[PDB]
Amino acid sequence: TELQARGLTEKTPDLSDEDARLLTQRHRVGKPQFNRQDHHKKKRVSTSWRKPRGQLSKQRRGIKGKGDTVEAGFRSPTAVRGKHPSGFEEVRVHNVDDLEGVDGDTEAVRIASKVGARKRERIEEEAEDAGIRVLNPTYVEV
Amino acid sequence: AEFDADVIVDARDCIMGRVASQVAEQALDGETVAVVNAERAVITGREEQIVEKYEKRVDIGNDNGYFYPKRPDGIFKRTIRGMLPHKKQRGREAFESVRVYLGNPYDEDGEVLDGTSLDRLSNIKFVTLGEISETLGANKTW
Amino acid sequence: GISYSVEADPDTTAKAMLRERQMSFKHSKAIAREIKGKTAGEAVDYLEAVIEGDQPVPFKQHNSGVGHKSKVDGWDAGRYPEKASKAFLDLLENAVGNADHQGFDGEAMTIKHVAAHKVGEQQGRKPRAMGRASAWNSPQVDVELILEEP
Amino acid sequence: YAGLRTPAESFGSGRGQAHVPKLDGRARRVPQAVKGRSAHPPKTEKDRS
RNA sequence: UGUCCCAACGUUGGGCCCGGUGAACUGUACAUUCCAGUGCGGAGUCUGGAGACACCCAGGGGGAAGCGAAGACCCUAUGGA
RNA sequence: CGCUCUAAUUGGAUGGAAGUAGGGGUGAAAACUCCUAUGGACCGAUUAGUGACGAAAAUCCUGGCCAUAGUAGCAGCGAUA
RNA sequence: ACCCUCAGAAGGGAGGCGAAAUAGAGCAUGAAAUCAGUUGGCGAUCGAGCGACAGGGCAUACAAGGUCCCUCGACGAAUGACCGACGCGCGAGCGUCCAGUAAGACUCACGGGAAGCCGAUGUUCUGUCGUACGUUUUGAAAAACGAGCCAGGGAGUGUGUCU
Ligand SMILES: [Cl-]
Ligand SMILES: [Cl-]
Ligand SMILES: [Cl-]
Ligand SMILES: [Cl-]
Ligand SMILES: [Cl-]
Ligand SMILES: [Cl-]
Ligand SMILES: [Cl-]
Ligand SMILES: [Mg+2]
Ligand SMILES: [Mg+2]
Ligand SMILES: [Mg+2]
Ligand SMILES: [Mg+2]
Ligand SMILES: [Mg+2]
Ligand SMILES: [Mg+2]
Ligand SMILES: [Mg+2]
Ligand SMILES: [Mg+2]
Ligand SMILES: [Mg+2]
Ligand SMILES: [Mg+2]
Ligand SMILES: [Mg+2]
Ligand SMILES: [Mg+2]
Ligand SMILES: [Mg+2]
Ligand SMILES: [Mg+2]
Ligand SMILES: [Mg+2]
Ligand SMILES: [Mg+2]
Ligand code: NA
Ligand code: NA
Ligand code: NA
Ligand code: NA
Ligand code: NA
Ligand code: NA
Ligand code: NA
Ligand code: NA
Ligand code: NA
Ligand code: NA
Ligand code: NA
Ligand code: NA
Ligand code: NA
Ligand code: NA
Ligand code: NA
Ligand code: NA
């Protein structure tokens, strides 16, 4: 009578003490929006990032208040870079075969959006039997 | 009429600036202040020059205006306004919770703040706000 | 053209629309604005008073250079848009018509919703001096109306 | 000759218009003009072997 | 002899209000400013103060170094006629 | 990093592709991805190629559109109707 | 189609077809600029590169993020005391000891708590910094030049030879 997500939605990866520290760091520190300079001043100018090139650009010159310039110093910790917030490493999956070789302790799985309902149900059920959590589960009424 | 002043300060024979400075400090700390006997507060210097300064202020102006008070009432208050960011929300609040009066409309005799009292016995070159106001053309309503 | 921008319960609701009327889109906004919440009956009386010149239509957005009207309350500028008003009286006649043929008491129904939309312009061209020409167009208006039982 | 088949000319300064060759009040020939030539297009002469 | 002293009154069409019709110029953004200062030495936007409740109608045009025209002057181009 | 089309290898889609709107996650970032709605037929990945391959600008071009504005004009003419 | 309305072969209402009419005629999809109505936030005593980073208010269906808060305790870099005891200094105050102690960012464990609640998103308030962008220029916020806004279009290519 209510909606229930298929699979091991609650499943949690196990991570070394270090990795969990680093993942918790990344989540604490965060990073700036790194949006394009002045995108908020002109509609035609999109948020996507482009390096400010104006010889006079206040951002390009690093004037406090004009936004942070993309630098390598902003990168995330090697050990965690790319992990889903849960700590799981994602694996893009299109069919049942793709499920083979996936560590349900370490990796969770994300079903390509294109995969239709029919093939989903198959993937979702065998994914769970293999101890793998599906990040984008189908919600059925039970 | 009726002003729940947490502090009632007496300006009689006290150095306006020094008092005003301390009143702003408190009003910014949230205190509701009321200054008493403004007509009797004093400012050191050579009367002649002092008056010139103020007369000039009265004369300065134009369409946009430069409203400067002539009553020892206003005078004292504008002085305090100069010691507060009266245009910032916090500063208008503090300034507004401060009021100056001619004489003392309370029952309690106000208090004399440290280092704002002037010794008439060892000081001859000074002026009374009221003397100033009479010179400005104010109406002696006190 | 438009489509009803609001959901209406058929059991307690009457509808009506005007299609591509060539009239001031600015007047319509004001008119709609003014008669919403009124009784279809009240609305008719009002718009006829406007047409008559006894009741002014508050102009709150498109008021540049409009002269103040004593009768406007809470505001100042206003006019008597008789053309637009007449087209609204057609809209109303139709809505109250449909409402009766459905068993309701048309006139007593509340104007739950009324909005004007500029659907286009019948384009025109005006010769100007120096051998050049400039636009001389006509707005085309659409307007939705939804009647609701009190 | 795609886009070059026109006698379009630019009016030059004077009418608060960019110097773009026009004809019958329509911009033409130049690459940044709709219906204008393609700046650096594919070429038959190129050796694709 | 209203050119002037020195302006007045009047006439007609406008102007103003209402119905109908219905453009153009112009627009980086923000924008209630004023006095000063500063700055590429001619600032509504910086700095300091002052002033400033919102909207609307009419006006004569002080300012936006107002709008209009890639300066005719002047110089430069191994330019043109 | 991203775009077009070619090839090899290998996948998705009417149990709903592309696109679009709003929304969640990743990447320092170019950008990648997921969810819901819409849509109703196509769409990818990896590798090696391909090139009329990336825009905020050029008094840029073309189209559309907002303010301007319910504003100017619909009075002036020796034919005031 | 039929019926009602209308000056009406208009239009509108009700209805019918179809998987769909938000496929109804320049009718696939249907972006942005933008318009109407409307919801959330702000709002008629107040200041202007429109933001960035911090932190508050208010607002939020599900989904795709799930964290967050307080007691206490563990760990604890640089830094690092109050009080008190003694001894200096005209004085403000300093020295020795108590002590590299208490404290000390992050992180964690037990217990307790939150589901608009944490993140995130919308808007608004406060703090810090902040006079666009690109170009010309020794020097541009510039009273130097360009653009009304948006979408789409818009600029190192080919052959020959040389290196
Ligand atoms: Cl890197
Ligand atoms: Cl004045
Ligand atoms: Cl202030
Ligand atoms: Cl003395
Ligand atoms: Cl319009
Ligand atoms: Cl840590
Ligand atoms: Cl190049
Ligand atoms: Mg933008
Ligand atoms: Mg007027
Ligand atoms: Mg002619
Ligand atoms: Mg062409
Ligand atoms: Mg100022
Ligand atoms: Mg020139
Ligand atoms: Mg000459
Ligand atoms: Mg010659
Ligand atoms: Mg392969
Ligand atoms: Mg154009
Ligand atoms: Mg005007
Ligand atoms: Mg006559
Ligand atoms: Mg269509
Ligand atoms: Mg108020
Ligand atoms: Mg110079
Ligand atoms: Mg493009
Ligand atoms: Na003094
Ligand atoms: Na004055
Ligand atoms: Na208005
Ligand atoms: Na009234
Ligand atoms: Na009124
Ligand atoms: Na031709
Ligand atoms: Na132009
Ligand atoms: Na060839
Ligand atoms: Na005369
Ligand atoms: Na002027
Ligand atoms: Na907020
Ligand atoms: Na330039
Ligand atoms: Na610039
Ligand atoms: Na300047
Ligand atoms: Na224009
Ligand atoms: Na190109």
- All structural domains of chain C, each given as residue ranges with its CATH number in brackets, are 1-150 (3.90.470.10)
| Per-residue three-class SS string for B62-104 | CCCCCCCCCCHHHHHHHHHHCCCCCCCHHHHHHHHCEEECCCC
Q: Which strand G bases fall within 7 angstroms of a protein CB?
A: 4-6, 8, 11-15, 22, 32-38, 46-47, 49-54, 62-68, 106-108, 120, 125-130, 132-137, 140-141, 149-160
Structure tokens at A9: 């939605």
Q: Which amino acid is at B94?
A: A
| B44 CA from centroid of ligand 24 (Å) | 5
Nucleotide nearest to D27 (CA to C1'): F61
Structure tokens at C120: 């286009």
Place of tokens 């104007």: C111
User: What CATH number should be reported for the domain holding residue B53?
Assistant: 3.90.1180.10
Under 8 Å CB-to-CB from D33, ≥6 apart: which residues? Answer: D20, D21, D27
Contact C31, C88 (CB under 8 A): yes
**Rounded CA–C1' distance between A59 and G140, in angstroms:** 16
Q: What count of residues does chain C have? A: 150
The whole-angstrom separation of Cα C57 and Cα C62 is 12
Contact B132, B42 (CB under 8 A): no
Amino acid whose CA is nearest the C1' of E49: B82
Three-state secondary-structure class, residue C28: helix
Fill in the DSSP letter of residue C107.
G
Count Cβ atoms below 10 Å from residue B27 Cβ, excluding itself. Answer: 23
Owning domain of residue B87: 1-142
Q: What count of residues does chain A have? A: 142
Nucleotide nearest to A12 (CA to C1'): G66
Q: Which of C57, C81, C88 is nearest to C71 (CA)?
A: C57
Q: Which of B74, B65, B122 is nearest to B98 (CA)?
A: B74
| B76 CA from centroid of ligand 25 (Å) | 16
The whole-angstrom separation of Cα A103 and Cα C37 is 64
The whole-angstrom separation of Cα C99 and Cα C97 is 5
The whole-angstrom separation of Cα D49 and Cα D46 is 9
User: Which ligand is located closest to the Cα atom of residue B87?
Assistant: 3
Contact A104, A131 (CB under 8 A): yes
Domain boundaries in chain A?
1-142
Count Cβ atoms below 10 Å from residue C55 Cβ, excluding itself. Answer: 19
Structure tokens at C129: 């001096």
Q: What angle do CA B29, B34, B38 make, to 5 degrees?
A: 130
Instruction: Please identify every residue whose CB atom is under 5 Å from ligand 2, which is an ion.
Output: B 61, 65
The whole-angstrom separation of Cα B34 and Cα D45 is 94
The whole-angstrom separation of Cα B105 and Cα B121 is 28
Under 8 Å CB-to-CB from B120, ≥6 apart: which residues? Answer: B13
Beta-strand relationship, B126-128 and B98-100: unpaired
The whole-angstrom separation of Cα B20 and Cα B75 is 11
| D18 CA from centroid of ligand 22 (Å) | 26
Contact C67, C79 (CB under 8 A): no
How many structural domains compose chain B?
1
Chains that touch A (3 or more CB pairs under 8 A): none
Three-state secondary-structure class, residue B23: helix
Fill in the DSSP letter of residue C143.
E
Q: Which amino acid is at A123?
A: I
